[model samples]
Target chain A: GPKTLHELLERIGLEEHTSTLLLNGYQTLEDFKELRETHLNELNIMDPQHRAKLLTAAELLLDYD
Target chain B: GPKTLHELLERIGLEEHTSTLLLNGYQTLEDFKELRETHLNELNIMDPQHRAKLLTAAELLLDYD
Candidate 1:
């Protein structure tokens, strides 16, 4: 289980943005579920593919039992 | 913004389950979005009406901007 934010990000190949996310106070995987386009933009994660991948990963993680 | 777990529970009239939920490691409103039927059953929150109300409230909160 990707219970930690770092694990989730790493699993989706987004480990590079872990520090950026942590600097913004996102400490857990659950925080991704609350992330929006504005937040992504603010975090300077402007790559469309990365954004979609992160959001989709978060959605899939939350949907998982 | 019902950012806190207590506020969300109170808004949904499930304040009585606050401690039960806390004991189970649910500390934020976002946690409720991840909740499923099995979690509710394990929490002993078997009342159908309360279950529906809580889940609906969590869904609405996530849908909000």
Candidate 2:
């Protein structure tokens, strides 16, 4: 939960797309914690499972505080 | 090239994101050709280089018709 975006993604098995998102300006889990749909839509993440994984991870980040 | 999204992505070394886009409704190169920055933004494609490669392939699809 307190991990960086890279670690979060790696944990979710979606680490491969990390570079793309990072390159696009999402540097942290906080960035993803906000209306993650934007991040999902922007990344065009169509897989239901993967999208859910991202949300779960984002929620996990939110839990950090 | 006149290939499917799967082929195009494979060619661009972006095969990983292909399924996501497909699940998101991008079923073909024609669908991709209709986009440039939109798809890139949607996918949060941060790598300028990878983003450019997608655009290049999208344009090549436009050339197909």
Candidate 3:
């Protein structure tokens, strides 16, 4: 199983968004399972491709478990 | 939002199963989202109706978020 939220973000090279994610109360690997494009928009991750990356990463994590 | 794993189990009157859950490393509310009937069987939760109750509770928790 994945160890921590930080590790997941780091593995996906999205560690820069760590503080933003934490500020929004997303503190567990499972929390990312439901993330959507709208969530990225709300988080101010404006790049469309980047949002896709995140959503894909989240989905992949679910399969990983 | 869900404060802790213990609180979630308590809310659904499954506090008695806490040790069994924890022993299996289910340490977060989100971790329950993907639970299936197979998981319950593996966990030794043998009662058919009780398994249904747990599955329903887990699905409800996802919607609750």
Q: Measured by C-alpha RMSD in angstroms, how accurate is candidate 3?
A: 12.6
Report the candidate with higher TM-score, 1 versus 2: 1
lDDT of 2 by residue, A3-61 (tens): 57787666446787788777777788767666376667877876655665565445434
Q: What share of the true interface contacts does candidate 2 keep?
A: 0.00
lDDT by residue (B1-65, candidate 1, tens digit) is: 45578876664457999998889968776676676668889999987667655654554445431
The deviation in Å at residue A37 for candidate 1 is: 1.2
Task: Tell me the tens digit of each residue's lDDT in model 3 across B1-65.
Answer: 33676776664457777788778867777777677778788899986545654665565455443
Candidate 2 chain B: worst-modelled 10 consecutive residues by lDDT? B56-65
Q: List the residue pairs that clash in candidate 1.
A: none
lDDT score, residue B51, model 3?
A: 61
Let me know the DockQ for model 3.
0.02
Model 1 per-residue lDDT tens digits across residues A1-65: 55578876775567999999889978887676677678899999987667765655555445441
Worst 10 residues of 2 chain A by lDDT: A56-65
* lDDT value, residue B57 of candidate 2: 48
Worst 10 residues of 3 chain B by lDDT: B56-65
What C-alpha lDDT does candidate 2 achieve relative to the native structure?
Answer: 0.63
- List where candidate 3 sits over 4 angstroms from the true fold: B1-65
